[PDB]
Amino acid sequence: LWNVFQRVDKDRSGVISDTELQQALSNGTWTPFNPVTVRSIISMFDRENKAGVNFSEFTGVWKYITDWQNVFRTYDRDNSGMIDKNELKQALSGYRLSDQFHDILIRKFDRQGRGQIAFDDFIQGCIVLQRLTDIFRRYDTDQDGWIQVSYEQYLSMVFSIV
Amino acid sequence: ADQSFLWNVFQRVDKDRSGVISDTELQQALSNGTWTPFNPVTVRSIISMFDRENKAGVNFSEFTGVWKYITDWQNVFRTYDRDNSGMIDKNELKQALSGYRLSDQFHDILIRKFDRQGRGQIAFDDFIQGCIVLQRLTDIFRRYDTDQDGWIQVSYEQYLSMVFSIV
Ligand SMILES: [Ca+2]
Ligand SMILES: [Ca+2]
Ligand SMILES: [Ca+2]
Ligand SMILES: [Ca+2]
Ligand SMILES: [Ca+2]
Ligand SMILES: [Ca+2]
């Protein structure tokens, strides 16, 4: 791990920045790992609001990304290195989502634009879905799948998301 | 033709002379009456509204849209800042946002949400920000509130679609 951390710390400054974390990562493509995802992950582990991670926080970041990669690999059952619609259907089977909705999700998080989902966009869409579903559940106390909300509640709800 | 004096404004802002005003260039050119830099999120949104090339920036031809847009906001802002103190308070905010028919206390929620100076008033950049977000969120709400009683009822998947429209 130590050895891995120094390698990522390009300028040897003892703190891994966004840029540095991004260049250590591959989305399986010719494009950069999504800088929005790099930053969500860093702010999860950085406790001194400094847009960076030191070694002990980096052990947390690295475990987390490697665990996501394990998930990605588990469901990419043709080893194509992209999650296609039916693989996503497997991956999200615990959400009880319709076929039509998986297309919407792909449209939304697929940055490559070919109707498949790369590792970075996989992480992004999974975390967004998860955050949103939890916020939804705060309203759906009777777990019937429907909510009824006033204009003011709705706004506050969006203010709580983003 | 066309416009000589806007060109000067453009070059001052375009410090690197790349021919494109970036996010940071625009932010450094803009003032909020404060020592904290102009809301970077507000800057990015304005750039996104006028950029037709997806280059994270605006060229001269788009910048005349930017100049007009920011200037129009200055006028709306100076209009509701009735005492010309350079911040908008609850009382002023209530006047600005009449047409929304928002409850009294919701105004405090808006102030907390968007005032980054933490004094209970809203500077010019944070004012644009909340108004942009309010109008955008409201149009999305109106789409779902076909009858306009102020209520929506959505499924989980509809809820997710609606949030995807916004985020
Ligand atoms: Ca470093
Ligand atoms: Ca696959
Ligand atoms: Ca319910
Ligand atoms: Ca420039
Ligand atoms: Ca005032
Ligand atoms: Ca309604």
Residue numbers in the entry:
A (entry chain B): 28 to 189
B (entry chain A): 2, 24 to 189
Source paper text:
An asymmetric unit of the crystal of des3-23ALG-2ΔGF122 in the Ca2+-bound form contained two ALG-2 molecules (A and B) as a dimer. In the structure of des3-23ALG-2ΔGF122 in the Ca2+-bound form, however, NH2R123 (corresponding to NH2R125 in wild-type ALG-2) did not form such a hydrogen bond. Three calcium ions were found in EF1, EF3 and EF5 of des3-23ALG-2ΔGF122 at the canonical EF-hand coordination positions (x, y, z, -y, -x and -z), though water molecules at the -x positions in EF1 and EF3 were absent and no amino acid residue coordinated at the -z position in EF5. On the other hand, the side chain directed toward Pocket 1 in Ca2+-bound des3-23ALG-2ΔGF122, but it did not fully block the entry path of Pocket 1 as in the case of metal-free ALG-2. Since S120 is located within α5 in ALG-2 but is placed at the end of the truncated helix in ALG-2ΔGF122, an α-helix-supporting hydrogen bond between OS120 and NG121 (G123 in wild type) is disrupted.
ALG-2 (apoptosis-linked gene 2) is a 22-kDa protein of 191 amino acid residues containing five serially repetitive EF-hand-type helix-loop-helix Ca2+-binding motifs (EF1 to EF5) and it belongs to the penta-EF-hand (PEF) family, including the calpain small subunit, sorcin, grancalcin and peflin in mammals. ALG-2 (a gene product of PDCD6) belongs to the penta-EF-hand (PEF) protein family and Ca2+-dependently interacts with various intracellular proteins including mammalian Alix, an adaptor protein in the ESCRT system. X-ray crystal structures of various PEF proteins including ALG-2 have common features: the presence of eight α-helices and dimer formation via paired EF5s that are positioned in anti-parallel orientation. Binding of Ca2+ (or Zn2+) to EF3 enables the side chain of R125, present in the loop connecting EF3 and EF4, to move enough to make a primary hydrophobic pocket (Pocket 1) accessible to the critical PPYP motif found in Alix.
